[PDB]
């Protein structure tokens, strides 16, 4: 029906879990069919690293939760 389940969280800050077990936290700006993700102002945790503008491939994505509201 709605397709919204991803579009709802768009523009929000999001906590994304990778297949190796990393944590990517960034502003969720875009996705696609494969769940390739566009993450603005993105940092990595496991130790914190500033990455910046990140495109993650969906193959390696496991899950996402809402981390904070849109800047």
């Amino acid at each position: 029906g709605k397709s919204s389940k991803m579009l709802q969280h768009i523009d929000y800050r999001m906590r994304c879990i990778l297949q190796d077990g990393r944590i990517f936290i960034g502003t969720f700006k875009a996705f696609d069919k494969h769940m390739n993700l566009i993450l603005c102002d993105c940092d990595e945790f496991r130790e914190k690293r500033v990455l910046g503008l990140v495109l993650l491939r969906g193959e390696n994505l496991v899950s996402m939760t809402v981390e904070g509201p849109p800047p």
Partner: protein, 162 residues
């Protein structure tokens, strides 16, 4: 101009120049630090510069807060349970505040991850042995007032105060 939930919700929010999530609480004339619960532990940095806070106290449990910029306020005392509400506090900038006695800096010994500390432009700075006192009482600090804590200073602070 109480630091309120409503205040925090309309406050500029952004990714700073050192790539951390920072909340902008500058120039509001806040007198007392309170109601931080509403930030929801979502910030790596909080900028409280140019306000009227008297005591660095009143924080909820904030696990992600790593940097506190508290420039040009009126800090004259540091709360005692700070590590219990801010476990990963790594950088504390207190430039141009009102700490006057070496003993008032004692509560910073309990911040286990504190590595970057700045207390410039505080009366306490001109007290005899101020630097060695901080080094011995807050050994976890690696950079003090933008100068590297060196081994020779650690040893010298071990003699005095041993």
């Amino acid at each position: 101009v109480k630091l309120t939930a409503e205040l925090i919700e309309q406050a500029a929010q952004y990714t700073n120049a050192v790539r951390d999530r920072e909340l902008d609480l500058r120039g509001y004339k806040i007198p007392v630090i309170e109601n931080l619960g509403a930030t929801l532990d979502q910030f790596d940095a909080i900028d409280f510069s140019d306000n009227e806070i008297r005591k660095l106290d009143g924080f909820p449990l904030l696990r992600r807060l790593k940097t506190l910029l508290v420039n040009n306020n009126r800090i004259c005392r540091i709360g005692e349970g700070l590590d219990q509400a801010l476990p990963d506090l790594t950088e504390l900038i207190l430039t141009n505040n009102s700490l006057v006695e070496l003993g008032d800096l004692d509560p910073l010994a309990s911040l286990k991850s504190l590595t970057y500390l700045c207390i410039l432009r505080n009366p306490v700075t001109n007290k005899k042995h101020y630097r060695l006192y901080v080094i011995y009482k807050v050994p976890q600090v690696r950079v003090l007032d933008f100068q590297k804590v060196k081994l020779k200073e650690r040893q010298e602070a071990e003699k005095m105060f041993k």
